[PDB]
Amino acid sequence: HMLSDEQMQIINSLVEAHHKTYDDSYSDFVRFRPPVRRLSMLPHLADLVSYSIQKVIGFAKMIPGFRDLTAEDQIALLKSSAIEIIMLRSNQSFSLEDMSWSCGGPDFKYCINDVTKAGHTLELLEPLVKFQVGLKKLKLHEEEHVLLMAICLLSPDRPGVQDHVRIEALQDRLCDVLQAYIRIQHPGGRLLYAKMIQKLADLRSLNEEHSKQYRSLSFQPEHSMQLTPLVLEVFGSEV
Amino acid sequence: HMLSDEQMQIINSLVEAHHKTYDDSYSDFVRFRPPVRRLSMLPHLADLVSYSIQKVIGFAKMIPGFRDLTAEDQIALLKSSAIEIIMLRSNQSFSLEDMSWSCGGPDFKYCINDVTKAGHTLELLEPLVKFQVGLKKLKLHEEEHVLLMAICLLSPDRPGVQDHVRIEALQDRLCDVLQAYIRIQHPGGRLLYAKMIQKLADLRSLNEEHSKQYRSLSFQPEHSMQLTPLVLEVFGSEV
């Protein structure tokens, strides 16, 4: 069988949005507070993460349907899933070799070494890298990788979501394409779809862990003053 | 006549505090978000200013007497005068030659050129530079320069101050030393004290102007998200 135009349109809409919100040159990183190898990485990583939220937001605004949700629902979806979309989008720079994130080169090559001095512990980093490695192995296509981000972001089972039904539709019309594409365009992708959805479940645990650790950090002003207004607002607890 | 030990003690206490909170190497500037020559300077200047607040706070905590005020009064004094202390402390790097702020070298040499793309207008920059030039000419001693900062910061006529009387005492015991020192240790400083107090009055107008312009900028989230948590909190309107 084969996909339909409507479906193909969705894929081109997403893939484009990703391209438009993910700079392969990573030249924006030079504008972050310099990396430094006591939480010496917090400034640079905080900037990287804030910057990523801005990209994740830009991506969402282009997911077809998303822009028609209520401003309230849009936020609820972002606040709860932004951290997962960031973990998903960051895989495109994760390297199995050096086991790190290589972004344009040195200074922007975050080994498990430097990633420690950002306020988080192994209780997060361990599962995180484990995730990046596992995910990196599914050698997804750009099309599938971008779909998974739109699916993750359009999960109606996030706290705060009002219309936990219209979002159900959207995510469903999304999982359809993913299932289809994998069937029609991915050789040896018979057990893929199921492996991907499992990743979305792993993102839930990582989300939980990051949340706990973020709270402890964020409670200490000597540390929260190192963050950015956007990071504070998005990862904040304001209802 | 000559000063007393008590007075001399105050001067050594201040001068030391200034030395301890003002790095002549300006090596901390490398850690700011890089300067960039549309409000391209906002990131770097926001970082410079946030960093300066931290220094101004550190200075205050060492002004004798200040630490005994109520936590509430301490804040009221900082929130209202921090911007003036920064303008006063920044003079130590202002250069009459190039008419700019030279901090360790290039990238950190802010001409009236780059200082424009930070969100402020000539309605502030004009009087500001005018101030820096005028002040730079009073060729103050470190002792007098540091006293003027402690006097400015201990003004009881700032909104929010509760004990507008105990602070009156402190600032007074401060103006005493300044008047004395200028008399006993500054040749040709007969008309100085009066010129200095006039500067404290100019700082009031600059403060007013910055406040107006800060409000407009700070009202636009695309811009306020460029600031830091400390800058937002200190220049904020929270009562």
Binding site: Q54, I57, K61, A71, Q74, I75, L78, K79, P229, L230, E233, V234, E238, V239 | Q220, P221, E222, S224, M225
Partner: peptide, 10 residues
């Protein structure tokens, strides 16, 4: 309540 998120979302 979510000043920056709003401005960014339009």
């Amino acid at each position: 309540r979510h000043k920056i998120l709003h401005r960014l979302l339009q």
